[PDB]
């Protein structure tokens, strides 16, 4: 029987959309599916701001950031515990953490 | 000796209500099995089945007995008890209690010429309990209760004389057949025919006439 009433993830009013490549699995999965995160960080991490904000030129400066929109896939989005097997009802909760 | 914890229980033991219909008419949630024992003695029980069932302990297995009892006079009131426990003997009697608490009324009727004392049902009725659906159909005199031995017996205690049937679904699961047969006869008083079309003005509920008489310690 049907596990998910949305089947995969949102279709409804399309029937097909272009797929992408699982950022780590190197797989392939339609854009409508596929777990997604927006990986922003600092160039020089946290511990290093000391040596960095000190041993430079420029007043204080302004730390740069990286912008990587990850596309995972149920295979490697589970393995990397990006998501996980929530209980029967728990599954319904579309609510973001 | 019987000690009524219920309000309806008191007024019955205390002779303030003496008839069964007095409870149906006012639609009163019966809780004590002693009530219907008093209001309705000369009752009869027929034990329908004893079909043991099984499962698990947190390792191996669980295994008990399942009993089916119908109770009835032969006159308009009938009930169904399904109970399963650790003993045959006790889960039987256990049901005769749950049977009685379930006693329901019948609008028995005529197939045609209303010549003295109904011989059938009001109208066509029908019950369901998953898959099985039994249908009850009025009948001429001399005919009989045309049904499967189970249903018939339930329709015997129901006190029916002549009725036709048309059961559909897995008639073989005894428990589910009987329940819907019950569900059927318990629906006769459900049908608003033009006999009952008139207007009466609503009795006041004996839970308020002898209200002073009833209430708690």
């Amino acid at each position: 029987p049907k596990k998910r009433a949305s089947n995969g993830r949102n279709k409804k009013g399309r029937g097909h959309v272009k797929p992408v490549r699982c950022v780590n699995c190197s797989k392939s999965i339609p854009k409508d599916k596929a777990i997604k995160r927006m990986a922003i960080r600092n160039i020089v991490e946290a511990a290093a701001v000391r040596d960095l904000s000190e041993a430079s030129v420029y007043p204080e400066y302004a730390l740069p950031k990286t912008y990587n929109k990850l596309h995972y896939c149920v295979s490697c989005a589970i393995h990397a515990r990006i998501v996980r097997v929530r209980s029967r009802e728990d599954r319904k909760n579309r609510a973001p953490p | 000796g019987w000690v009524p914890v219920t309000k309806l229980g008191r007024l019955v033991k205390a002779g303030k209500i003496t008839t069964i219909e007095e409870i149906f008419l006012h639609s009163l949630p019966v809780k004590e099995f002693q009530i219907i024992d008093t209001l309705l003695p000369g009752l009869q029980d027929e034990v329908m089945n004893i079909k043991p069932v099984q499962k698990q302990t947190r390792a191996g297995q669980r295994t008990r007995f399942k009993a089916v009892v119908v109770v009835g006079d032969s006159n308009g009131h009938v009930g169904l008890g399904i109970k399963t426990a650790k003993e045959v003997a006790g889960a039987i009697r256990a049901g005769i209690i749950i049977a009685k608490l379930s006693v329901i009324p019948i609008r028995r009727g005529y197939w045609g010429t209303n010549l003295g004392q109904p011989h059938s049902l009001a109208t066509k009725t029908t019950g369901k309990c998953g898959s099985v659906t039994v249908r009850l159909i009025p009948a001429p005199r001399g005919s009989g209760i045309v049904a499967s031995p189970a249903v018939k017996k339930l329709l015997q205690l129901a006190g029916v004389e002549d009725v036709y049937t048309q059961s559909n679904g897995k008639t073989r699961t005894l428990e589910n057949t009987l329940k819907a047969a019950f569900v059927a006869i318990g629906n006769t008083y459900g049908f608003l025919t033009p006999n009952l079309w008139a207007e009466q003005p609503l009795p006041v509920s004996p839970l308020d006439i002898y209200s002073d008489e009833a209430s708690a310690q």
């Binding site: - | 639609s27 209303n114 003295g116 318990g186 008083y189 459900g190 006999n195 207007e199 609503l202």
Partner: protein, 87 residues
């Protein structure tokens, strides 16, 4: 339920809902009987004599137990300008 020689058979004659006039079931344990006190000249309520409505399992279950009572209240003269037929 008459018969041959007009005798009254049929072991019991069901009440009837007042918001639909549909038979009040023998096991309709969501059906109910409201009893409204009839007053006398100024204030004093009267034991014994009350105004009485009777609502059904179905009507009540679907939330229509307020509108239907009010409808029935104004009507038998228990209320004034609370429920308004036309809407």
């Amino acid at each position: 339920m008459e018969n041959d020689k007009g005798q009254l058979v049929e072991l019991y004659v069901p009440r009837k809902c007042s918001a639909t006039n549909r038979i009040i079931k023998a096991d309709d344990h969501a059906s109910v009987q409201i009893n409204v006190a009839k007053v006398d000249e100024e204030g004093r309520a009267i034991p014994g004599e009350y105004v009485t409505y009777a609502l059904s399992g179905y009507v009540r279950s679907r939330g229509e137990s307020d509108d239907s009572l009010n409808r029935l209240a104004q009507n038998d003269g228990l209320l004034k300008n609370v429920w308004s037929y036309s809407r």
